[PDB]
Design a protein around this ligand. Structure first.
Ligand SMILES: *[C@@H]1O[C@H](CO[C@H]2O[C@@H](C)[C@@H](O)[C@@H](O)[C@@H]2O)[C@@H](O)[C@H](O)[C@H]1NC(C)=O
Ligand code: NAG
Lengths: 274, 99, 9
């Protein structure tokens, strides 16, 4: 299926406590594979996935140099934004950036993007055409004009359609045993009493990969997507994912409700009952 | 923007006393990013907990995973304590092995 | 491989 290469960048100022915290985390699909965190005596770009051992020392030296360059530019950004928004030097602020590209199963580009947020709000984003930017407010309109005069979109587009796609393909090749695998979900249902003769049925889906999955509860062949409660799919600590979905049913009727699990590793979806 | 974290504590495998496993504390949907997350065993901080999977959603809220290997016993209790500016008091979420 | 750089705002 399709795959993605994404970099999540966060820079946070801490007045009175020194330089801003700077973190850049890279993901292929939903698996963390590289990271840089400024909060270390000797911050270095580090592998977070076993297959990244396949890159030579130059990869790490280059990515580390680039990261240190980012710490500096984001430190400047935090100051600039204080001016744009007329804010004081006493408070902590956050800049976030998500950059990435996605390819189809054939390795061809599907889409690319880069979006910024300041204090958790949209700031500026590259439009889908990868040619122009859209600004969320007047401060971002200043940035838009700077980047247009400097021709930043063309350079970013070159990275998204070129470099980003090429490296994603290489990561998928180098880490194929990990990235292109399919671990089927193993599911079970738990039962919990409630007041008012009602029971909570919780359908668990464990040990699966990739992360995409669908858990539904049915009654009389129909989905109860409405009254269901669920958690966002989440990492389980070893590179696999987990998820649960619950529904509150009448006591004594548990038998009529079925959990359905749909996943890439299930030619036929799983059907369970308490 | 200020969003209170959702704190989720769960094991990789259904628990079986005496059998190795992994305990997770996934802290999500929060903002600002500054946060303190500690995993506790019988009220005592667990050393060398791994922090990973830091990311953020389309609405910019943060996500991060704390995890550690562990072998559950019938008596040991585990929890995740989180301090964030959105909460006046630190929040301790215990692992519910019957969930 | 990460973006070459992030132009200042
Ligand atoms: C994964 O790909 C293997 C072929 O690739 C190896 O050799 C190079 C092409 C380079 O990509 C190395 O990193 C790879 O180890 C193939 O032999 C395996 O069978 C594949 N694994 C499976 C079955 O998914
Ligand atoms: C910025 O805010 C201060 C008040 O804190 C005010 O004195 C000043 O005029 C503002 N600057 C601008 C240009 O809006």
């Amino acid at each position: 299926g399709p795959h993605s290469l994404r970099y999540f960048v966060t820079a946070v100022s801490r007045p009175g406590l020194g330089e801003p915290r700077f973190i850049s985390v890279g993901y292929v699909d939903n698996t963390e594979f590289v990271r840089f965190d400024s909060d270390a005596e000797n911050p270095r770009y580090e592998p977070r996935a076993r297959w990244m051992e396949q890159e030579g020392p130059e990869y790490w030296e280059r990515e580390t140099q680039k990261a240190k360059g980012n710490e500096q530019s984001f430190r400047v950004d935090l100051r600039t934004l204080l001016g744009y928004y007329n804010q004081s030097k006493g408070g902590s602020h956050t800049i976030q950036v998500i950059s990435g590209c996605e390819v189809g199963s054939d390795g061809r580009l599907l889409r690319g993007y880069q979006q910024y947020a300041y204090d958790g709000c949209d700031y500026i984003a590259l439009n889908e055409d990868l040619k122009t930017w859209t600004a969320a407010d007047m401060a971002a309109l200043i940035t838009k004009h700077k980047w247009e005069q400097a021709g930043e979109a063309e350079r970013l587009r070159a990275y998204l359609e070129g470099t980003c796609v090429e490296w994603l393909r290489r990561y998928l090749k180098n880490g194929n045993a990990t990235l292109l695998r399919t671990d089927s979900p193993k599911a079970h249902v738990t039962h919990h009493s409630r007041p008012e003769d009602k029971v909570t049925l919780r359908c668990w889906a464990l040990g699966f990969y990739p992360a995409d999955i669908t858990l539904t509860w049915q009654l009389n062949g129909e989905e109860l997507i409405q009254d269901m409660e669920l958690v966002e799919t989440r990492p389980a600590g070893d590179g696999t994912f987990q998820k649960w979905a619950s529904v509150v049913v009448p006591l004594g009727k548990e038998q009529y409700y079925t959990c359905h699990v749909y996943h890439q590793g299930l030619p036929e979806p799983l059907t369970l009952r308490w | 923007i200020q969003k209170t974290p959702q704190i989720q504590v769960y094991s990789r495998h259904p628990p079986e006393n005496g059998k190795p496993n992994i305990l997770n504390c996934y802290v999500t949907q929060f903002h600002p990013p500054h946060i303190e997350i500690q995993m506790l065993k019988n009220g005592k901080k667990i050393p060398k907990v791994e922090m990973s999977d830091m990311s953020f959603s389309k609405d910019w809220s943060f996500y991060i995973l704390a995890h550690t290997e562990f072998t559950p016993t019938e008596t040991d209790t585990y929890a995740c304590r989180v301090k964030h500016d959105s909460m006046a008091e630190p929040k301790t979420v215990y692992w519910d092995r019957d969930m | 491989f990460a973006p070459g750089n992030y132009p200042a705002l």
